[PDB]
């Protein structure tokens, strides 16, 4: 739960998103990449619990509907379905 | 009151005489009902009712402030601001506390365009001197406030450790939300920086050519307080103030060099040899007595230090001002006042009580505050402890490889191992641990923060930004 942020930084560094994280201007785009830990009870495995998210703050949180605290959480369930694959 | 008397003399008495008395003396068919009609037509009744409503509002305010005697922001601490709030509730409203009454009246009269025009002209007339004071405080940092009215004021009527206050009662905006506090403190900081710039150069005013960002006078207070107009005005004033202040420090004071010397004194940056020299000349005293023993004659330490300072560079104002001191509290007990650590669990070595400090001279104590100086001092005490134990292990290695008693090959071929070999192995482990801790600290925390600060003053824009980088570096170090 605290190695995951370092894992995320490294994955962004070990992937095509490294041109975005190490950009002089668009680093703020990846600054919003955060992970969330689901709650499916005891005896779960990090595979069916770990999900990615994106923490948007204004003005963008007003324009881009991401997993808002009381919405349908479209991005989260889509990410679960593709996480299976 | 001047506008009230001018209204009376030039409008009320003019109406009275030139209409009522001239019709009472020259106009037949005049009568009391026509008297009241004339009064109602010339608007004199409406304008006088407006003035009397404002007077009654000021009177109820005075009465509340006379009876309500049962009375009693972290941003001023989040920033390096030796400024307090003056929560005094004065007996009569002043300045902003009356401009707010007038704005409230203009609101309560929305729809009566004649009353709104009258009250707006009244506000534009009354607030002219307040706009003058605010313009002066925003473009030259001058505080000419003989009637205790402005948002802020200097204490202390040598005289450089000035403390500002903020009269909460006379503020223009209530200072409750976050943008209002941002604007208030931006005004305060603009004035403070401009006063600093003006006091350093020993000039009475800052020439208008000292920056490309020129500020105009406030010629309409109602418009200024309409909306974001005040925010932009204060933003321009703050930009000009920061530009001039940073020009002054980075060119006339060489603040880069002052920070370099402060990092050489307290961080060890590019100054390891000076610390080693200090230790070699003072290796015996910093371990003596495990304390100051009965106010021990540790004045010899101060004499050694002043002797070294005599041979220090004269153009290094900071080392000329460096004062070696012996604080009665150990470094861990000093750290316990800010961090979740635990004190000793008996006197403990004198270097644990050794410390340094500098009375940073004005104006350099505006950016280099006392908080960052305490951080420098604690960091230097820790660095001195580390370098001191490293020098201990250095001279121990020296005595282990220069005393033939230890190089001697012998010792029953059993004593040699269980004594000398175990000693050398434990000493090697101690040396590796100490040197590795010092390496990690110096080149992964201290070096990182020095490099960050160095990045900050590569074409900066705000003095508060430089203060923030400095304090954030020292906090990253002290919270490491």
């Amino acid at each position: 739960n605290y190695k995951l942020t370092r894992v995320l930084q490294e994955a962004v560094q070990l992937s095509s998103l490294r041109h975005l994280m190490n950009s002089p201007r668009n680093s703020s785009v990846i600054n919003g990449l955060d992970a969330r830990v689901l709650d499916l009870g005891h005896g779960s495995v990090g595979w069916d619990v770990f999900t990615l998210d994106y923490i948007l703050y204004p003005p963008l949180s007003l324009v881009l509907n991401v997993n808002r605290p009381f919405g349908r959480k479209e991005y989260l369930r889509i990410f679960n379905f593709l996480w299976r694959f | 009151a001047y506008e009230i008397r001018r209204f009376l003399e030039d409008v009320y008495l003019k109406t009275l005489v030139e209409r009522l008395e001239r019709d009472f003396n020259k106009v037949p068919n005049f009568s009391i009902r026509e008297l009241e009609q004339i009064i109602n037509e010339t608007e004199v009744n409406k304008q006088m009712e407006l003035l009397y409503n404002i007077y009654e509002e000021i009177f109820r305010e005075i009465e509340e402030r006379r009876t309500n005697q049962s009375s009693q922001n972290e941003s001023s601490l989040h920033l390096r601001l030796m400024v307090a709030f003056d929560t005094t509730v004065y007996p009569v409203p002043k300045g902003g506390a009356i401009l707010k009454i007038f704005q409230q009246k203009i609101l309560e009269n929305l729809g009566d365009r004649s009353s709104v025009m009258f009250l707006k002209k009244l506000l534009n007339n009354i607030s002219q001197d307040y706009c003058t004071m605010l313009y002066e405080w925003l473009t030259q940092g001058i505080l000419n406030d003989p009637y205790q009215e402005f948002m802020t004021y200097d204490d202390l009527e040598r005289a450089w450790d000035t403390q500002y206050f903020i009269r909460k009662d006379v503020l223009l905006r209530d200072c409750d939300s976050e943008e209002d506090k941002n604007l208030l403190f931006k005004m305060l900081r603009t004035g403070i920086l401009l006063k600093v710039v003006r006091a350093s150069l020993q000039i009475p005013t800052i020439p208008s050519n000292s920056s490309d960002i020129t500020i105009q006078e406030i010629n309409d207070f109602a418009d200024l307080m309409e909306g974001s107009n005040l925010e932009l005005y204060v933003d321009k004033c703050y930009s000009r103030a920061n530009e001039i202040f940073l020009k002054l420090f980075f060119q006339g004071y060489d603040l880069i060099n002052v920070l370099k010397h402060l990092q050489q004194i307290f961080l060890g940056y590019q100054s390891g040899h000076n610390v080693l020299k200090f230790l070699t000349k003072n290796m015996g005293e910093l371990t003596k007595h495990y304390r100051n023993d009965n106010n021990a004659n540790y004045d010899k330490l101060l004499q050694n230090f002043e002797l070294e300072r005599q041979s220090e560079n004269p153009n290094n104002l900071m080392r000329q001002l460096l004062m070696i001191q012996f604080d009665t509290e150990t470094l861990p007990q000093v750290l316990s006042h800010y961090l979740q650590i635990y004190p000793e669990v008996t006197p403990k070595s004198a270097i644990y009580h050794l410390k340094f400090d500098i009375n940073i001279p004005y104006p350099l104590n505006i950016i280099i505050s006392r908080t960052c100086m305490i951080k420098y001092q604690i960091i230097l005490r820790y660095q001195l402890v580390l370098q001191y134990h490293s020098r201990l292990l250095d001279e121990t290695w020296m005595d282990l490889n220069k005393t033939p008693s230890w190089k001697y090959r012998g010792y029953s071929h059993t004593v040699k191992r269980r004594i000398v070999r175990a000693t050398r192995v434990l000493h090697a482990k101690m040396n590796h641990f100490i040197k590795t801790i010092m390496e990690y600290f110096n080149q992964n925390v201290i070096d990182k923060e020095v490099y960050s600060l160095e990045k900050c003053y590569r074409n900066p824009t705000l003095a508060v930004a430089i203060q923030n980088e400095l304090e954030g570096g020292l906090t990253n170090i002290m919270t490491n």
């Binding site: 739960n1 605290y2 995951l4 942020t5 995320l8 990449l33 955060d34 992970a35 969330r36 830990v37 689901l38 709650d39 499916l40 999900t51 998210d53 923490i55 959480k73 989260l76 369930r77 | 009693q72 922001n73 001023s76 601490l77 390096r80 601001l81 030796m82 400024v83 307090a84 709030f85 003056d86 929560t87 005094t88 004065y90 003989p146 009637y147 205790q148 206050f165 006042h337 800010y338 961090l339 006392r370 908080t371 305490i374 951080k375 304090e471 954030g472 906090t475 990253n476 002290m478 919270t479």
Partner: protein, 54 residues
């Protein structure tokens, strides 16, 4: 559908910032604070208009 956790990178950043802020607040408190509160003990008068008794 589930009571997921708060962000992780944001959570740890907040923890670090809170450590720094606690340190800075303790440091300010040790320095008698940089902001305080006052009441005014004295008032102006003018030698052109001076007074002594009623």
């Amino acid at each position: 559908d589930v009571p997921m956790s708060q962000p992780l990178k944001e959570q740890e950043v907040r923890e670090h910032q809170m450590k720094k802020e606690r340190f800075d607040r303790a440091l300010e408190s040790k320095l008698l604070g940089k902001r305080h509160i006052t009441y005014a003990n004295s008032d102006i008068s003018n030698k052109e208009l001076y007074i002594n008794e009623i």
